[PDB]
Amino acid sequence: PISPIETVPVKLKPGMDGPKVKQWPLTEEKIKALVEICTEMEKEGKISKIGPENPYNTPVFAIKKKDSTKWRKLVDFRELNKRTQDFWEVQLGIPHPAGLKKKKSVTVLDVGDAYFSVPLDEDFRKYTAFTIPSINNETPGIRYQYNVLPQGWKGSPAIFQSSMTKILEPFKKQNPDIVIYQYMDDLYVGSDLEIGQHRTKIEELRQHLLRWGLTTPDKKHQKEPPFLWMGYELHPDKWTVQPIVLPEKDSWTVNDIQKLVGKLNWASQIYPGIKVRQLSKLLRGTKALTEVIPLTEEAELELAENREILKEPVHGVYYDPSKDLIAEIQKQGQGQWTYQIYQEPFKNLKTGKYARMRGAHTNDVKQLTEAVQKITTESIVIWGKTPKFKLPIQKETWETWWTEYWQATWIPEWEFVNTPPLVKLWYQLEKEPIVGAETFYVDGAANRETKLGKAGYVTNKGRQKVVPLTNTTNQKTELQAIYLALQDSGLEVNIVTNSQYALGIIQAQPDKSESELVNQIIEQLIKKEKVYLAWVPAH
Amino acid sequence: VKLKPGMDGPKVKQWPLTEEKIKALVEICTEMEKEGKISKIGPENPYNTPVFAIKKKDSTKWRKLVDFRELNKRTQDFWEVQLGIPHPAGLKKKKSVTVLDVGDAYFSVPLDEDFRKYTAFTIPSINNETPGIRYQYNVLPQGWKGSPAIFQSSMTKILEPFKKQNPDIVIYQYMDDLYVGSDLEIGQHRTKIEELRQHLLRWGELHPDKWTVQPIVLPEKDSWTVNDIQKLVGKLNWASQIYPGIKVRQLCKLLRGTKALTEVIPLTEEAELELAENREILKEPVHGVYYDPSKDLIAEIQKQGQGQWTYQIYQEPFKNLKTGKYARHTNDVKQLTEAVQKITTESIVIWGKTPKFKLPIQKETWETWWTEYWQATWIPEWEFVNTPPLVKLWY
DNA sequence: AATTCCCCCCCTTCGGTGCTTTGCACCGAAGGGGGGG
Ligand SMILES: Nc1ncnc2c1ncn2[C@H]1C[C@H](O)[C@@H](COP(=O)(O)OP(=O)(O)OP(=O)(O)O)O1
Ligand SMILES: [Mg+2]
Ligand SMILES: [Mg+2]
C-alpha cells in the first residue's frame, strides 16, 4: 500500500511553468502493458484520473525489468527536471563487500514497488500529469497524475532514500547489534544470533516495514547462501563478483571496445593483473560509435592475458577489524600499476589497478605517489583506516626524491618489498658545475610571425653548431637546443641556457613524456654520468 | 541576515572521513541535536558544506569543524558594528598575544530562520551503509564570518567588565578565537588571563616583536667563478624588480667572455663597487609598499629543503609586505600544514584578514592529509601552483 | 530507432584559466562504457 510517511515538500524553479510535452506514438504491446499497469495503479490510489482542469502532460513509456514478464513504467520528465528545484543527493557512494565483517547469520531483503509506496507532494502532483495513449488508436485517451513518487523524476531517488532511512531509524536504534546495509530499497541484514533467532528478528523487521507501507515479497527475500547482493555473490567465508562475460566477437567496433573496457575495469577489483592500456588507446582518434576498429596485436595480447586471468575463479575475504590492512603495489610498465589489499598473505580483501597519466611530463616516483594517494582515499571510504603500504621502491631512493623535489610529498607508513620491477630515478642533475668537462652556452629562438627559428650551442673550446628549423615555437626551439647540446658532447657536460621553460621540464626528472622532443632528451640524460644545468638571464 | 546580491548558497560536496573521525563526529552531532543547535533536514535543501573533526593539540577530545569558506564569500558583508571594530596597533607589537577559544559562545544565539538553509552539511558513512545524515544549524555556526558579528553586541559587552580595569591591553577577535596581548612576564601574563577565562565562564602565545626578517643579502666570496657571477646577475635582475635601482651593468661586462663555468675570474673595480653598493640598496625596503584594505592578500610558500620553508605576503606582485622563513624532517605535509597555520596567525595580527595561499603541493595530496595535522579553527582560502620556481632567491 | 532518474568508478575530449616566453600546462565538465537501485 501507500506509506503514511510525511511527504517531502518540493517546488518549481521561480518563473517556470509545468511541462506541456506531447505523447509519442507507442507500439501495441507497450500500450497494452501500460494500460494494465495504470489500471491496477489507479485501484490502489497510486494514480488519479484527471480531465481538462490540468493543462500539463509528459510522455510515458515502458521497459522490461531484469526479471522479465514484468514491465517498468517510466515517464520522460526531462522538461520538468529542468524546471524542478535543485536537490542535494544523500547517496555518497557504493558499499563494498570487502568492507563487510564476518556475520554468523545473513539475510537479504528487497522492498517491492519501492517508489510507488512513497507519497508525492500534493502541490507537485499537477505537474506529473501524463496520458496513456488510445488503446490501438481511435479513443481520446485517459489522463492520469502521480500520487506517488514517479520513476524518471530527478527528485525521486533522493526522496525515497531519505524516507527509507526514517523508516529504518526506529528499528536500528532499538536493535544496535544487527548490521543493516541499505542501498535504496536493497536491504542486507546480517548478525550473530544463530538462524533460529535470526529469522525471528527478521520477521520483526518485515512487520515493521509493512506497518510503514513498504512490503517485502517472499520471492525477493533470500534466506540461504550464496546471497546475490549488489552484483556480488556473498558466501559465509568469502565473496566473489557475479559472473562476468566478455564478448567473443571478431569484428570490434568502437562501442564494443568501450563495453569491453568497462567490463574489465569492473572485473579489475578482485581479479589481479588486468590491463586495459592497449585496448583504451584504440579510442584516441575515433569519431563514430559503430565503425569497425582493428586490433593492433597489442590489444589482442592484452585481451588474451585478461581472458586468461578471468578464466580462473577468484574470491575475496571479509574485513577483520582486529588485524592490519596491508597494500602491495607492483609496477606493470607503461605507467600501469596494480595493487592488492589484504590482511593475511595470499588472501586478498580487494584488488585494483592505477593507470592514469597526469601531466605532460612525469616519472615513476611521481606516478607511484599518485597510486598511493588513490589507494589511501579508497581505503578510507571502505574501511575507514589507511593501510600499511609495501612499495617496490628503496628507502634511499624515496629519501633522495622528497628532499630534493620542490613540492611537498609524503607517503604513509610503508615498507620496502623486493619485487623485481623496482622504481628508480634514472638520472640526477648535479648541484655544482663539473670540473674537467666542456661547457655549452646553448639556446636558440624562433619567430612569432613566420614560425621558424634556429637552435645551436657555443662551447668554451670554440666549437659551435647551428641548425635552422621551422614549424616549431619558441619553447620548442629551446628544447631542441638542449637536446642538441647533449648530442655533441662527451660523458660529462655543463649546459647553460637562457630560458626557464626547459629548466622546469628537466629539473622535474621525467623518464617519459607525451611530447616527442623531451623523450630523446631523457634518452640522452641517462647515458651521461654527470650533467649540470644552469640558467642565465636572456640579456 | 542576507546573502550577497545576485548570488546563491554553498554547494560543496563532502569528502570521505576516517573511521575515528566519523565515529566521533556522529557522537558530537547526536549530543548536538538533543540541544537544538542542529536539526535533521532532507534532500530538498540544495546546499551543503563539508565537515570534519579537528581534535586540537593537548585536548584529548574532538572538535567539529565546518568548512564555511564558500559561504563566507557569498555572505553579504557582515558588520561587527561597522565591519570589525578593532584594528589593534600594539597587538602587532606588545609581547604575548594569546589566542583563546570563544568556542561555545555562539551556541547561544539562534540563527535567522530564512538563512538556516545555507548552513547544511552531510555526515558520511563507512562503506556507505546508510545514506548520509543531513543537518542544518539553528544557532550561529562556527566558521561563518557573519557569526562573530552577530555576537558582537553580546561580545563587546563582556570586554568593558575587564578591558576597562585593564585598559592598555588590546583584545582582538577573529572568528571563534580571541587574540589578547600583554607586555607582562610569563608569571603575570598567565595569571591575569587565567582570570579572563574565569571572567568568561559565568558571563556567558605569539610574540609580534620578532617579526621583520625581509633579507636578500648576497653571498660573500673572495674567489668568484664565472658560474658564481652568472648566479648573481640572475639573482640581481629579479631583485631589480623588487628593489628598483639595483645596479649590475659592470657586473655583467666581465661575463662577456664565453669561458668555462669553473674559471676563477677576478672582479674589476667597477664590479667590486657595484657589488658592494648593491648591498646597501638591499639594506633598505622598497619605498612605497602601501597597504590598501580594498585589495586581497596573497601569501606564496616555497620549499627550501632540510625542513626549511619561506613565504612572502604581498598585495601586489614584487611589492612584498612581509617576507619570512619557517624552520623545522620526516613528514612534509605536516610541516607545510603547520607553516600555513603560522602564516595565517601572523596575517591576522598584522592586517586582520587571512591571505590567499599558493601551496607548493600537488592538489590531491592536500585533502588526503591536511585534515589530519590541522589544529586551527578557521580555514584560509588556498590555491595550488603547478610550476617549479627558479633557483633559491630567498635562501 | 532510441526516448527516463540518482550514485560510484574509468577513459577520452574540449574549452576555460593562468602565466605569457600570446604556447603550453592544468583542470573541470561532458561524451562513451561498466556496476547498483
Ligand atoms: N531504470 C530505472 N529508472 C528509474 N528508476 C529506477 C530504475 N531502476 C530502478 N529504479 C528505482 C525505482 C524503483 O522503484 C527502485 C527500486 O528498484 P527495483 O526494486 O528494481 O524496482 P521496484 O521496487 O519498483 O520493483 P520490484 O517491485 O520488482 O522490486 O529503484
Ligand atoms: Mg532488486
Ligand atoms: Mg524492489
Side-chain angles (χ1 to χ4, degrees), chain A residues 1-69 71-286 288-539, chain B residues 1 3-56 58-79 81 83-189 191-196 198-268 270-395:
Chain A
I2 306 170
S3 53
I5 166 72
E6 313 318 302
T7 79
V8 171
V10 64
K11 276 150 30 214
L12 269 194
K13 281 188 197 287
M16 315 271 253
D17 210 359
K20 305 239 198 332
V21 197
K22 219 184 307 308
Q23 182 66 49
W24 326 310
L26 301 166
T27 196
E28 260 313 308
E29 55 164 0
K30 301 242 182 50
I31 282 181
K32 184 181 303 313
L34 275 186
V35 173
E36 249 86 326
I37 292 169
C38 280
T39 279
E40 336 286 352
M41 263 189 120
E42 211 255 338
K43 279 191 205 133
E44 317 191 270
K46 304 189 180 315
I47 50 177
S48 306
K49 297 177 165 42
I50 55 170
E53 79 269 8
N54 212 300
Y56 311 119
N57 205 85
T58 302
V60 278
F61 62 102
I63 62 166
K64 259 173 153 266
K65 283 176 174 159
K66 225 143 217 248
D67 145 67
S68 259
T69 80
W71 289 85
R72 173 183 309 283
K73 171 182 182 331
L74 303 161
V75 199
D76 177 57
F77 276 128
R78 260 185 275 160
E79 191 129 288
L80 178 65
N81 280 340
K82 285 183 253 276
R83 291 154 169 171
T84 323
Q85 64 143 103
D86 270 289
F87 289 84
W88 190 257
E89 268 74 29
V90 289
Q91 188 65 40
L92 310 179
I94 317 284
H96 204 274
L100 293 186
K101 276 142 214 158
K102 191 170 292 184
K103 297 306 180 140
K104 185 196 289 183
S105 314
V106 162
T107 285
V108 185
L109 289 154
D110 197 295
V111 168
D113 280 315
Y115 279 16
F116 296 157
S117 295
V118 179
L120 176 70
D121 191 36
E122 210 153 8
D123 288 339
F124 201 77
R125 284 172 198 202
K126 67 180 88 59
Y127 309 117
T128 66
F130 60 92
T131 298
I132 299 302
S134 156
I135 26 112
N136 183 52
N137 238 211
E138 76 293 301
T139 36
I142 336 111
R143 302 217 17 229
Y144 291 103
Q145 91 185 7
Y146 264 105
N147 303 357
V148 294
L149 282 186
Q151 273 178 94
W153 180 44
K154 77 185 266 192
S156 297
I159 290 181
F160 179 84
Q161 283 163 0
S162 328
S163 296
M164 186 99 208
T165 297
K166 290 209 283 234
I167 289 168
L168 281 174
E169 181 260 6
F171 185 84
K172 300 167 68 112
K173 166 240 292 171
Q174 94 182 15
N175 263 123
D177 266 332
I178 286 185
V179 172
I180 294 178
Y181 273 68
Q182 54 157 308
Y183 185 82
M184 279 255 201
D185 61 318
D186 225 0
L187 288 186
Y188 159 88
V189 187
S191 72
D192 326 300
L193 330 174
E194 60 93 10
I195 218 71
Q197 280 98 304
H198 177 77
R199 300 197 193 289
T200 296
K201 225 76 193 71
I202 285 306
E203 299 305 317
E204 296 176 27
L205 173 62
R206 276 168 45 109
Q207 283 316 298
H208 174 72
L209 287 181
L210 187 62
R211 284 185 245 122
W212 269 107
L214 318 170
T215 89
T216 81
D218 209 347
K219 131 164 182 183
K220 296 262 208 127
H221 158 45
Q222 330 179 39
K223 302 170 271 291
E224 300 277 19
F227 305 93
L228 295 319
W229 177 72
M230 302 255 304
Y232 303 100
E233 221 157 37
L234 319 179
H235 289 90
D237 283 20
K238 53 188 177 69
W239 67 266
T240 101
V241 298
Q242 278 176 34
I244 284 144
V245 29
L246 302 171
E248 275 275 355
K249 33 183 61 43
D250 318 59
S251 303
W252 295 92
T253 98
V254 176
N255 227 27
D256 278 322
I257 298 302
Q258 290 167 349
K259 296 178 146 93
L260 180 92
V261 167
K263 295 189 106 86
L264 283 165
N265 280 341
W266 161 255
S268 86
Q269 78 184 172
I270 182 63
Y271 282 91
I274 301 270
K275 312 184 230 196
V276 296
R277 161 65 60 86
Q278 297 312 310
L279 278 153
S280 145
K281 33 160 266 302
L282 298 200
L283 330 171
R284 280 252 189 74
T286 50
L289 304 175
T290 166
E291 33 183 344
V292 158
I293 288 327
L295 295 203
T296 56
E297 169 272 11
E298 291 142 75
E300 266 156 295
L301 204 30
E302 290 210 331
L303 194 40
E305 306 186 302
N306 294 349
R307 266 202 177 90
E308 219 91 72
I309 288 163
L310 249 63
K311 170 193 34 149
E312 58 203 14
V314 318
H315 62 74
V317 291
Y318 292 125
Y319 184 50
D320 196 353
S322 92
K323 280 205 225 145
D324 323 65
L325 270 183
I326 307 179
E328 294 212 22
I329 304 189
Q330 286 104 9
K331 171 183 160 74
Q332 303 283 67
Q334 321 135 48
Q336 304 185 92
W337 311 77
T338 58
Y339 62 89
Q340 42 264 183
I341 294 114
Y342 62 91
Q343 277 168 337
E344 287 275 306
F346 322 103
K347 281 190 263 326
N348 295 340
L349 282 169
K350 194 188 182 298
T351 325
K353 69 178 191 58
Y354 176 81
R356 187 186 196 323
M357 274 221 65
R358 333 185 65 280
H361 317 301
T362 189
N363 58 350
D364 282 334
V365 185
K366 268 152 79 173
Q367 261 162 18
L368 179 124
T369 297
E370 292 173 16
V372 152
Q373 272 170 207
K374 185 227 188 197
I375 297 159
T376 286
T377 175
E378 153 152 66
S379 266
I380 289 178
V381 168
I382 304 178
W383 299 286
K385 91 153 75 142
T386 176
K388 270 166 25 164
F389 285 98
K390 290 225 235 165
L391 309 182
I393 178 176
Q394 310 233 65
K395 310 288 244 146
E396 303 83 284
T397 307
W398 172 250
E399 190 269 6
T400 315
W401 169 255
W402 83 266
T403 63
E404 286 185 23
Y405 197 34
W406 52 277
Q407 274 191 356
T409 39
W410 188 59
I411 287 183
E413 164 158 5
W414 64 285
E415 216 200 346
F416 160 72
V417 69
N418 208 340
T419 69
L422 279 202
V423 165
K424 166 199 46 169
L425 290 162
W426 290 104
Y427 49 113
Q428 175 126 291
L429 283 319
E430 220 202 349
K431 280 166 253 82
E432 69 280 14
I434 292 103
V435 277
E438 203 158 2
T439 294
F440 287 75
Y441 292 103
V442 54
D443 253 327
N447 197 4
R448 202 260 218 211
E449 33 256 60
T450 43
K451 288 278 234 213
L452 52 144
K454 45 149 219 172
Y457 56 97
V458 186
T459 61
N460 59 22
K461 308 273 188 300
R463 326 169 305 113
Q464 31 170 289
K465 187 207 321 282
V466 193
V467 279
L469 57 137
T470 187
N471 213 342
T472 63
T473 86
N474 281 306
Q475 280 92 337
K476 211 174 299 326
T477 47
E478 168 187 15
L479 284 176
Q480 252 289 1
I482 300 206
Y483 170 50
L484 199 163
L486 302 154
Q487 249 184 37
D488 212 290
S489 44
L491 284 188
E492 272 133 353
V493 50
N494 283 287
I495 277 143
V496 152
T497 157
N498 90 10
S499 147
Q500 254 267 351
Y501 163 72
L503 254 298
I505 309 204
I506 295 161
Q507 312 231 297
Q509 285 190 78
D511 45 43
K512 85 218 96 183
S513 181
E514 287 74 341
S515 103
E516 170 59 15
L517 186 32
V518 183
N519 266 320
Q520 43 276 6
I521 297 164
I522 289 152
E523 273 95 66
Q524 302 255 298
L525 288 169
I526 294 171
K527 261 132 31 164
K528 321 292 205 252
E529 43 262 58
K530 289 151 89 61
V531 272
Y532 168 80
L533 254 76
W535 172 82
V536 174
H539 267 212
Chain B
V1 197
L3 197 88
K4 222 98 207 192
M7 290 258 186
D8 54 79
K11 269 163 210 222
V12 199
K13 281 184 66 180
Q14 159 73 25
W15 53 67
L17 294 178
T18 325
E19 203 231 22
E20 36 155 6
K21 299 203 167 359
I22 274 180
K23 173 177 314 301
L25 207 85
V26 155
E27 183 215 9
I28 288 177
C29 278
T30 276
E31 293 295 323
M32 255 188 105
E33 197 209 1
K34 288 173 42 49
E35 287 195 37
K37 326 183 181 181
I38 52 178
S39 66
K40 278 174 179 172
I41 57 168
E44 79 265 19
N45 187 8
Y47 310 117
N48 187 83
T49 61
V51 69
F52 54 104
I54 208 55
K55 157 148 92 151
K56 296 223 200 67
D58 189 325
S59 302
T60 86
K61 102 187 175 91
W62 298 90
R63 277 225 56 251
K64 208 175 74 73
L65 209 152
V66 186
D67 192 327
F68 274 122
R69 282 182 262 138
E70 188 50 42
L71 182 53
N72 287 339
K73 316 190 325 223
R74 311 217 224 201
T75 203
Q76 172 49 47
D77 203 328
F78 226 88
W79 336 100
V81 87
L83 275 180
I85 82 94
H87 216 41
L91 199 84
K92 76 191 297 166
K93 317 259 208 42
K94 194 160 214 86
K95 249 158 227 191
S96 317
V97 286
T98 320
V99 202
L100 244 273
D101 47 83
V102 156
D104 210 62
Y106 296 133
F107 296 170
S108 270
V109 182
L111 172 64
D112 190 11
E113 225 289 309
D114 70 345
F115 210 85
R116 290 178 220 219
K117 30 188 213 175
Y118 305 101
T119 82
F121 59 94
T122 314
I123 286 148
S125 197
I126 285 309
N127 208 20
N128 327 98
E129 161 176 352
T130 62
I133 313 108
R134 302 249 292 157
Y135 292 95
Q136 82 161 7
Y137 269 102
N138 303 321
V139 312
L140 289 164
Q142 305 210 33
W144 183 33
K145 96 180 215 290
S147 282
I150 281 166
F151 205 69
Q152 205 80 359
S153 269
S154 210
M155 181 95 271
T156 200
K157 283 307 115 194
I158 348 226
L159 270 25
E160 357 239 279
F162 188 94
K163 178 222 273 234
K164 100 206 199 193
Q165 23 187 10
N166 290 77
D168 6 307
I169 292 146
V170 195
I171 311 205
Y172 184 64
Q173 160 203 252
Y174 199 74
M175 311 255 156
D176 332 347
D177 8 298
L178 261 172
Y179 300 93
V180 30
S182 182
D183 56 0
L184 268 49
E185 65 159 351
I186 186 74
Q188 293 219 353
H189 176 70
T191 43
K192 176 202 61 223
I193 288 267
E194 161 69 24
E195 322 286 314
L196 196 281
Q198 295 205 354
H199 189 272
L200 261 202
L201 265 184
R202 173 256 319 145
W203 244 102
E205 40 280 30
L206 199 43
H207 303 256
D209 23 358
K210 337 150 153 23
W211 286 2
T212 153
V213 223
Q214 283 217 125
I216 345 204
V217 193
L218 314 184
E220 42 107 358
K221 288 174 334 312
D222 50 308
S223 37
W224 283 67
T225 50
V226 170
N227 179 244
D228 271 297
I229 302 177
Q230 265 155 215
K231 280 200 263 236
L232 220 72
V233 181
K235 202 222 189 80
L236 269 57
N237 239 38
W238 149 83
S240 268
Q241 282 197 268
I242 309 269
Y243 294 15
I246 292 263
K247 273 294 121 179
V248 299
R249 323 316 65 210
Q250 324 293 311
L251 244 198
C252 319
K253 281 316 99 173
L254 45 56
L255 277 197
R256 196 37 50 227
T258 8
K259 328 98 176 171
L261 291 203
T262 91
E263 195 210 315
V264 230
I265 169 172
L267 300 129
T268 350
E270 297 89 312
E272 189 40 58
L273 173 278
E274 286 222 332
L275 200 186
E277 196 260 7
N278 274 308
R279 301 184 136 111
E280 321 320 330
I281 306 204
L282 281 176
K283 304 261 75 181
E284 29 189 60
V286 44
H287 295 109
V289 255
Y290 296 144
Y291 170 83
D292 77 311
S294 66
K295 294 230 244 151
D296 55 342
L297 279 169
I298 309 138
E300 265 131 17
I301 312 199
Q302 284 110 10
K303 183 187 198 273
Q304 318 272 337
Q306 302 65 320
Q308 315 279 105
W309 309 79
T310 246
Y311 59 90
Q312 282 93 235
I313 316 174
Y314 63 95
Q315 289 194 346
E316 198 97 304
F318 304 111
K319 313 269 186 287
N320 287 356
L321 291 195
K322 183 171 176 342
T323 85
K325 103 189 165 81
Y326 184 58
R328 193 144 48 48
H329 51 76
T330 171
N331 207 329
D332 248 15
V333 200
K334 178 140 180 266
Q335 286 173 4
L336 180 64
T337 295
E338 291 154 351
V340 169
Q341 295 187 208
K342 305 295 268 323
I343 298 171
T344 286
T345 315
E346 288 186 19
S347 176
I348 291 324
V349 183
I350 301 166
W351 311 283
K353 59 170 116 142
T354 333
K356 250 211 90 153
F357 282 85
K358 301 225 184 117
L359 302 177
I361 195 175
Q362 210 66 15
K363 176 207 216 94
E364 291 81 356
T365 321
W366 187 247
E367 313 71 331
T368 337
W369 301 103
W370 84 268
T371 64
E372 227 78 44
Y373 322 107
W374 200 265
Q375 273 150 351
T377 305
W378 24 249
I379 321 193
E381 183 253 312
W382 45 54
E383 93 180 357
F384 311 93
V385 310
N386 306 121
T387 279
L390 188 49
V391 85
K392 47 275 206 188
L393 277 35
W394 313 97
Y395 205 63

